[model samples]
Target chain A: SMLAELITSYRKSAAIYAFVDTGLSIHFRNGAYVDIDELSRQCGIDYSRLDRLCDFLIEIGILVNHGHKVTLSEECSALADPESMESLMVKLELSPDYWNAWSMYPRSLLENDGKPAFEITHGKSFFEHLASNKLLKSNFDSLMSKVSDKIIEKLLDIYDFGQYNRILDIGGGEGSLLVKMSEKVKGKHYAVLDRYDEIPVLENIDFINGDFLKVIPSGYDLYILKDVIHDWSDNNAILILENCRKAMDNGSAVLLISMMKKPQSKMVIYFDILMDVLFSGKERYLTEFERLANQAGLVIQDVKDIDESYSIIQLGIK
Target chain B: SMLAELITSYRKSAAIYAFVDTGLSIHFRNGAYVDIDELSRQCGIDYSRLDRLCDFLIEIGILVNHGHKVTLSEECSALADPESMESLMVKLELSPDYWNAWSMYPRSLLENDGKPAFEITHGKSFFEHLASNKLLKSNFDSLMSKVSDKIIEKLLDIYDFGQYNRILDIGGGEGSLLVKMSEKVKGKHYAVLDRYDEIPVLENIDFINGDFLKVIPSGYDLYILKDVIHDWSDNNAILILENCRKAMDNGSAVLLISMMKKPQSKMVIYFDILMDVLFSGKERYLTEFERLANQAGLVIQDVKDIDESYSIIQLGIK
Candidate 1:
């Protein structure tokens, strides 16, 4: 029976995605049950037509209808008043582009096809897709913006920013980490290397408009690779690490952050699919990380833990 | 956490479908574990490329591969060398057409567009789609074919075919039921009305090659509608019941068989979605059945249970 249940697992998502798309959660507020006619109006169909989907949603408990009035059950009522994280997740996960991208998951994972599932679905890489599609651009921003501060705070809680001076952040988008570090820990000069045409000059901060793969500016005490490697292949990631090694000397180290290889958690597994479907990049295990370090002529010096799934791998000269 | 699990339910179907599509079950027979390299070869990709999917399949227990070899764990090995039922279900459900059909479920349920999700996915109705797609033709045949003999026997066991002579099978596909009934019950003539634009002559058996929606050949003591009603909308189904009623004088009966209006069973709900998507048809509750009967000047006289979900409703003149 579990097999039967598992085989139809996609419908569970159908109910959830359909729930979010109709935005019914917003209507079921303040202990009020929205009438079936009112609900049908929200669905843009007549009551008779809405009956099938309505009953199924009730069956799934996303929307419970009794006596022709629809109300939220206790479980997903958090969705009724979604916080920033929930809103970001709901908007991003329940959209058509994401659904189609995920639908291509089987093919995307199987085919020798080098493109991300998102690219396969939209005919362009997610990076390009994000730049062009306004709605997804905002949601994609949430991938970074929603987690950017949180990840930074988590990293800050674990790793000491004061231990390294003249830090370089390779491919740091918007230099938020460096900017925040500049504010948090004084006396350490912060620099972020990106692709900005014109660098903005600021006190105690350096912005290099350059590529990490092409050239990483030399002589920094610590090079940060917090969220960089997982967006690239092993070869490309090794190249970045090798370049970071070239930019380093005595007492300099690399602080690379990523998810530990987790096959158990659905959250981690789903995210692994997300990264693969969006960037064709993948999360790595410690063994893989060690291989990367060895290939780049560096040895892992120390390791630290972040909140849940992430690990901070410390790299030094071999 | 249940909500989290529920939100990603579609991935469960994804894993199952992808498993069936790859036909990995075929290789895992003989209690043998196929090696990763061999598995990758089967997948048409390198082991590294297959790792993402391979791991997730393991995560879901569709597979389990730790060191090297891949094999089914205790649960789903039933899929290994699948029997007719399993093979038919796997082949049909895992196909691209069905996957795409289900993907359109949300919109299909929400729209007043009056199209099955299958129709919406393929831009034509499923009957046409099945008639044309050779692979689907055989599989669709399985829907009726797999259940035809079983259902016929069940019906024969519950409702004696010997009680009625000049039996008419409305839309009786292939006339298999009538042929069997004619052989089983002697001194009774059996006929099936279908679309052929011509009638076939036989002994104790007649084939009226005409449409049930258009006309029903008169003076038949019993009209059989085993699998017809679920494939049409209320307007069309009522039309069918009315035509069957019109063809009846007195002491004539209609036997309608379908899954009861059960929003509870995932099996029934999934089938409901299937019927809706393919034909824009729907299943009905007892109350709804009563309404349809009243509309056609018929009264429900008896209800017989068959298997777990099916209900055989007996109709008589009002």
Candidate 2:
């Protein structure tokens, strides 16, 4: 623990260079070559700072620092070689988008108008800003897709969809989720409904460009909304859920796949902090979820575990 | 999990607002009292950068940023409280002697000869660097005394100097530790051995002007060396131990109360990193302790647990 802290403290100021030297050494391994100086230059840090960073990397065994040269350790080398998630990190430094919205969230409470918290912190509302900024748009897309992808993987395994001939994936982006889900649960019909610009073309699935709260096609056995509800407050959630309630036929189920609040869990507690920080979007507890379901003229049939990030709330239009 | 990632990301880039405007709802909390623009000018940061810096602080919830006004938060307020560690950090910021050596640590590490890395990465040598640098001398004197004051609080639990009449406190800066220890283990003649100029005048304690290796007086039953081995490598540790051996008679016990490296422990682990970052000094393992102590011809009579940060290694001349 002390060693890790020491390494981290040094790393805060230093540049790291890993030289996978082709020269002879007893414990030699073919690994990444890191130029601390180059890293410093690229990162716009001083050479001295870069050196300290390198020293920290060495102390952590992430880099082998031998006076004149340094080389990335095995773990770092593997990440570089495969270009995996860790590799992506080194290749393209992850840009934090959610931080801006959340950190400025307290200002949301200070707003005089009836606008959302996001509007109060930043000059513009969240969606309005995202619509105009290309980088933010791409980040939002990636973030959304990644979260859905993770949820879909686990949800399919738990929820049996064999009896349902058709299921509407509400607020689905670009049909990426439907296409992937369709392949996973073959033969059952899939329809993706999303924003006008985000609709994608694909065979065997209907592309419906419509606002979820305003319109819905009948005869679908299931309605699925992933991460859509958490973005809205209780009132907004009621509007969307009511739309689903009016559309679903007898015995039909609506799946509210979204984040649920677990105040006791540190990760869950912090997520609430983050929501407060970014969008003032609070995760709902069990009672809150039940209340929202009741308000929409629906009763929760089953609440099943999907993954760490999400859950499946099967609701019936009673 | 996302929160952990967020924390890591925030720690790296979050702009902490050093100033805020507490106008409107958060008026009382605003750090806008400080003239940040003037402080920025003094600190050499541009006006735009300074403004952005303040904005970033508000974004992090460390400061309240209400558009035209900004303010501080409960966290920052507690940090700046007179009784808090922030006071010491402020002093550290102004202490050029200590900071100058700290500032050069990286460069000196780059210049370290391969064999035994320069013990002190900041100064020429830990002692020599301190000897020449007046600022560092004052800084080290105060810092070491601070360390001694806290350490003596715990050391009193295990160190009973009633068995030893003439006890010497090696590297005893300002004699605070020896004075406290003498008070605890009363009727023991406590002598603090340190540099002539830096020695403080204390009642009923003998203050000797000499280095531990060169001028330690004989006939003392106990010799104490706390936190000294960490500053030197394995080779130098033996030399210091041997010198202590020469100063003691047959009945004398060398109470070398040094902090030992505990694997996977928090304080031990974190402090280990501190050594590597500021200087190349290391926390020694248990095996190395026995080897070094054995080489110096003193048998470890007993090693009682003091606290996680320290141990009282009772070694006697057999």
Candidate 3:
């Protein structure tokens, strides 16, 4: 019965994705109910079609249709607010590229293909696919920036970044964390190292363009490798950590931010499988992380838990 | 949090498909546990790859992996037997063509583009795509036939068809139902009406190739339209039903077999949305069925619940 319900929810999720795509949910954000005619005109879509879609949403308990007027069901009305983090995360995960990748999961697992499911299905790596698809790229980037902004906000409450000066972010796209940190803390120079040729010009931030695997610019007091290792296999992950080790001075530390699987949240497991499906990498347990760090000649100095699923692993010279 | 679990299960479904595809489940049915080395040699797949797949299956509670042996988890051990109907149904839904169509669900709902989501993504309708892909077609055909066989068994149990001497099965591809029914009922002349130029040769069955929308041969005592109407929209469904009405005499009955949406089972809802995504059709509520039948100049004299989700709507001339 649970399996059947799971399948139903899976289909309902597709409906919700459509609701967001049609901008119907936004109407609820602006007001309690949307006029059918207004929604049709705003979306440049057929009214009859929108009505049918809304009917399904009602069946799924995500929306309530009152004759011609529609509003979010009580539980999902919060989705109407653009600022709702949960809704935003759902929207991000339900993106066409992301959801379709799961369809290839069986193939990936069967073959142990050593290729990302996204790449196998689409004929290119995830980033490469994003590079050519402009709108998807921008939307995904912004969504990531927003979620990271929240994570950073929470990270600030627990971890002290004041001790680290001249911080360099390895593989930070658009430098959202550095930009926020620049504003929050004084006397710290921020630099971003990414594969992108151009990052939007942010004030008081230095941008370096190159691969983190080959080289990481040396001599920053704190080298931040947040959310980067999980996208690589153990071997490739070690290469990046070794590069970071080479770049660091005696007092410098490498902050490897990733999900540790001990607490085993549903999100963590989903992301863990996603990483395996898309990157041949995995969210590690502390033991796995320790083993990986040891391979790169780094020792785990301390482990700090942050915001439910993520952990900030502090690594130093062995 | 439930959403997160749903995504995880979605990914897990793909893994289960792969497990079935790779024949690992069948191995468990034959033996208590599978030997890793033997499985690798048997499937001709890489050993490490199979190990990793089993590892994920264990994590998902579908299998248990001992040092070098794997066994089906208690709940999923039923899947070990290839004859298991529920496992077969899930595998059918998780097939590439089916899941990929679901991936385009948002676009289908947003535009109501009148094109099946399968067509939208694959550039061909489900049948057209099946026509070109040989392996997928056979797999789908066999799966459909197997399910229909089960449905026919249940239909025979509840609805007595001994009164009707001549029976015509409309759109009965491969004549699976006709074959099954002919075996069960004595002294009944059976015929299959389909649009395809060819039908599989079977003893005691006559094949008529024609479109049901345009012409259905008249003078049959009973017209059996099982699992066909759900593939078309309301107007087209009426066209087919009206043609069936034309083909039958005053005392003849039309058995409109389909799933009715009330009692709203999860499988019913999954199928309802699936019809929306893959065809521009919806599984009807009893009220909607009554309206459609009325438009076709037919009256629903009786409704018999068959199987879990399907119902046999016995209709007569108004």
Candidate 4:
């Protein structure tokens, strides 16, 4: 019954994104008890519009209003921070493509054609559109980097890398994960394998600018496919894993970091659908993963749950 | 605080719109313990997407699932109806223009320029785009007519037109309100003042094909301006009111039927901001309405609150 609460949260989040983008969040963050006229003048926003926007923000507990002046609530402090997940998600998920695509969700799901909702609406592949649209591309990169940073932050807390001397992060964009891992677990040499454009300019990591499905660099005892396999069809995913198996020594470990389907986790389901919509990839049940791993000449040695939506599947060569 | 709960409800509403559009609500409404695969096939949607959609819908209490079979939840039964407010709103509010315009809200609110976010993003006015876009225009008409019907339903419960004999509805598109009212309170002759293109073919009501701001037909004992003034600038609104004032006889009354600024009403604030964004007019506080009425040589006789947002403001000659 209380589950209907999600709709309200969606509107509030949507509204929050709107306010944050409009500078209302920044205005409130800058100073408490902002006079409507003053904030309007300072931000060059319509006073009438700002007044109502602030009223709603206040209505939703993001702001405290005393007549004409308002203050940001302590609870909404995270929203004020530029690097917070809320801010990052607004830039990422609320992008024109994603937001617009969701509107076409009904059509996208109905047509069941392999084309993504994004592609159906835009008439271009999401990847191609991202490459060409600079603003979106930059927001996307920033959002991904921010997400990777968060995931690594969590990964650092739980994951132990003492056994692996050298690790390879396949499809690691810009090497933030490798860089963070190298810092946390020192003495571990790192290499990143991705397209040349995706390899960020970084220090002390072998940047192998090539497709992972075709070739994975040799000589790494541990291969970490952070979020890669989820972005491919089962056949393609197995093929990529086969390539990894070819590159690995008999004793090398292959860790897959992605969402594992948990019965109660909505986030897993969300990503599962997102993969289907975006790239025909999907989060798989552990059983499905075991099946795919066996096909690719690997054994599921262990499965470690990280958070609600993420898991690390430790694999060993058969 | 409980206020944060509102955000969750907002998100849930948005997600409901997404699923409803995908036909999950409708499919489940048709039969109990619906087969996901069967529904997907019937709707021609992706089975995987439909499955996850059902999972989330069940999580949110819109539907209940037992393994592969699902039943629609009682609370969400309304969503299953194609003509329900929920279904209509998704088609109406989540349209490209409104959704896209909201994304530009920060810019629109920042520039505080008179331009609506719709115009800023779409390179045309909201009404202009609606007139040209067939689907949006149809949905717009349906949404407006549905809203008008709801308002009039409330109006019939609260408003008393027994005192007035001849009543005129200004800018009454297709005369839906008059038709509804004629059924509710008979023996009162009715007329609708709007462009010829907007006047619907109806019975027993004179339809005046002219602009209300420029001219209002005289000789009516009661002049009703329902949801018209909020679509113009203040000066334009005053001009329209002045025309109504001119048309009023000595004993005539002018009734303003629209949302008023209620202290605890979020709907009023939402509409106020929406008007500012969409039409440059706004929902007025009683004091502001008094000011506008005085400028137009009319005085507020009495203010009757109808529901939370709508009010019947009776006006008399100054």
Candidate 5:
């Protein structure tokens, strides 16, 4: 059911994308068009589908129908622009698919027997796919734009990454966290360490094209892993941590920023299972993270709540 | 991006269902009940799923949590019952095996291009499955309860089925329409037919328990297909109508009750496409229905709007 619902939502999104494309063509081309059949044919979708999509668009005042012809309403046309159109369509089209997928998550969990759903449905682990897909690399990069704008304010006020002179962000996309950190704490500069293809060169931030496992930038006082180690299995995760530990001389700290699994409040945990369904990795409890730390010859010296939903682990290897 | 988002949403739903099950149990039994971990085990799901479910329950004010403990709130408790608990969980479960079969739909559409998605996805087709699965049989039957309730109030006012008696309802499931007809008209009612397994027996409503292909009932002055004949290939639909024609004697009427296809408006077209997606078998348009009627040695004497979204076709045997 989870898989079925998941597919259904994607289909709806594909349908929505078609509608947005049609809407864009109609608006940008600057003409009143009533070619439902032509639009459907050109979009490579069923004519009936466009009709259904049009109904929703009309309900939202994006389109109007007269006789057998449809056109973008004036109000909708005013707001339609190159820059905002894509983002607005994405936000508007987020439902149906999103809700449908969530509706089937439990079965995905059951089918995998607690391992993760992605392995069961997709046949491969998710992080592996991420490592290969170049387009996804960019999507993740752009996603950080939204994530940084939304999450960074609370992150800065709650967490203390002040004492460290230099920080390395493992798998940091677009270097948002590092940039935010650099802006807040002026003296502490940062470096981006991930797949060579994932990050392009940027000003101010040290962009190193190397893997976290083998490439260790030494002399950094701290390695801040935000939502990185969770994307990997224990063996590889430990290797990264161990390599980072070896790179750090005395007086260096490993600050891992992540959400500790809360069984009672379940949305984030759903994200965990989602990772399993799409990727092989999962969300870990504080205890599990601690075990991961110890496996790498590191001891978690302190743990603090960065926010109600997230935590910071301060670990050291001596 | 689309696939990832969809998976996350489905996982959320699966987990939410598990949470619903455990929380409902607690509300009904009043004990130290299944924890998220335990529920995940019992349901054959992972903790992340159950946890998200619990979180959603809590987020929606349906549950209260302390540390790792979860309990149903008072309002949510009022909605809890034994049957509700089972039904909720059953509906909530992923049943991915069933869905995995269902997922073949889009590919089905692709491989067998020009056929509806359902025909492609489900291999043998929806009606074949509908004939076999009592769960689907009941779902369709139960669907009439809500669908009829929404449309009936408007239909009774606009369209009158006053001219006919001793009616045949082709593709009628469980003889619900016969029962409804019994309440509305003083006629010896019958379901012209469905698969033997789909025929639920009722008082005063005779159900001919065989496929419509082999046999046709005699002496029924009117043959009415309500929400039927849509899930059909154009050729097969004509064939079915031809059978209806041969079964009818002079003075008999063939009333086709269907949602208009190729609706001149967005609302109408959406209804058509949605039916096409879910029903897969006989989601048809008025034009297609007209063609079938014409090919079956029948003429559309008149058409009447019965409700906001439905119509009645009064046909005369040519």
Candidate 6:
């Protein structure tokens, strides 16, 4: 029963994505029982489509019906306003370029010309294509920042940062993960490295202005590359990591942080493929990260999975 | 937590579809624990894509690992062979034209010019487009028969033909449903209508030759349109139903059987759109059928939901 049940459930996603993209859920935004066809006219979803959708929506519990009028269900109310994670992710996932690339990805696995599907489908990389679209780029950044926080917080929750007397957060924008670290093990000095930001100074936390692409300051026992390494191609990503390697003293450790592709983490694997497709970078598994570290002249001393979607490579001078 | 869990589960479909389409899962068709990269080479997937797909496949329990070697898991062993329903449906769903039309569906909701998204994208209706393709049409007919049996059995399980003695199974391709009908109500003389086929005679069962689009002989106490009306346009579908209406005496009953667009049944609702998108046909809800029945001069006497996906519409002279 379970296998058969799961076999059928996979079909639900396409229909749900189609429904969410329609934005018809807005009709019951204020929770009104509008007549099916009456509301259909206002929504412009030809009554025929609405006529069928109303049945599915009611079934999925996204909406309910009584006496020919419909009301959105409470569980799916996030759809009413169109700003929910479900909405944002679906929009980004199905945006013309993303959907095109995603649809073509399977074929590329067999017939690839060594380019990401996004590049092949849209004539450029995901970020490059995203850069040209103002609205989608903004939405990408908006939803992405929220998703990154989930990754950031998961890292903060489980990573043990003891033995480092001082820490430098490279490209640690606005210091949430770094601040969370400070509270974890007290009496350590902390500083966040950004190109520069107008940040209020904490007691002994030095706010350094530096570009990781250029140099990372050496003084701390630990250099934390938090959520910063998966955005560049290998040579460039390694270039950034190599700078950290050069900045590390004989005894200092540099912890490179991002989600790692572990066997049980489905989303991390997706992020890996997503990074490869969109950014020409990736979230690596342990040995994969070890090679990335060794290239930068660092050796992985230890690795810790902070959670399903986040992990840390404890690095040191080789 | 359940809602949040389900919200993300929707994403698995795209990735799964891509992986299944890659045909990489077939490497382990015989359940060998092949080294990951070795299998990747044989399959021609660039090492990069396989690296990520392996991780996710392992997570979904579709594959499992011990060191460098991998084996397909028992639960998802269907992917190892391509003939499974999961493979067939995924192959069909992601086929160039279907995926292309599906990707355009959401856009069609607002931008449609009175054509189905499939028609708008493919430049023809679903069946007409299907008419030119031999392989896809065969695959369609194959999976559809297996799925239709599910509908056929459910109608036989629940509908009461208490008053019917001589029953005509209109367009019943085989005697399965009609045979099942005879088993339920003994002493009922059963016959199947097909367009001139070689069928052996049962002691009292008559096999008659007929063209439903043109005419139906009128003597049976009940007429069964099982798995037939839906492969048609509205007027054509109504025409089929009207012939049953015309062929019915004032006291005789007509049972139109199909999987209807019902709430709480996600699969049924999908079939409704699928019929529209692929066949220019539909599976209508009770009231929706009522309108069709009214046009056919038959009034729906009772409606029964046999299961989540199947329904029975009982009718008599208007």
Candidate DockQ values, in order, are 0.43, 0.03, 0.38, 0.52, 0.16, 0.26
- Model 4 gets an lDDT of 0.74
Docking class of 1: acceptable
Model 4 over residues B58-100: C-alpha lDDT tens digits? 7667788788788877676666777766567666776556765
User: Which is the winner by lDDT between candidate 1 and candidate 2?
Assistant: 1
Compare the candidates by DockQ and give the number of the best one: 4
Model 3 ranges off by over 4 Å: A7-9, A34-52, A64-70, A263-266, B3-9, B28-78
CA-lDDT, candidates in order: 0.74, 0.58, 0.76, 0.74, 0.59, 0.70
Evaluate chain B of model 2: give its TM-score: 0.70
Off by over 4 Å in 5: A1-38, A41-48, A60-104, A131-167, A173-219, A229-247, A255-318, B1-49, B60-113, B120-124, B128-167, B173-192, B195-218, B232-246, B255-272, B279-318
Error of 3 at A254 (Å): 0.5
Is candidate 3 or 4 superior in TM-score?
3
Error of 2 at A167 (Å): 1.3
Best by lDDT: 3
Provide the DockQ value for model 1: 0.43
Is 1 or 6 the stronger prediction by lDDT? Answer: 1
Candidate 4 chain B, poorest ten consecutive residues by summed lDDT: B1-10
Ranking by TM-score: 3, 4, 1, 6, 5, 2
Q: Which tens-of-lDDT digit does each residue in B38-140 have in candidate 1? A: 8777757556656666677777777877576777766677667544455556556655677657667667766777877788889888767775666666566
> In candidate 4, which residue ranges exceed 4 Å CA deviation?
A1-10, A28-33, A66-68, A271-277, B1-15, B148-158, B196-199, B270-277
Identify the candidate with maximal TM-score. Answer: 3
True contacts kept of each: 0.45, 0.00, 0.25, 0.62, 0.14, 0.43
What's the DockQ of model 4? 0.52
Model 5's DockQ score: 0.16
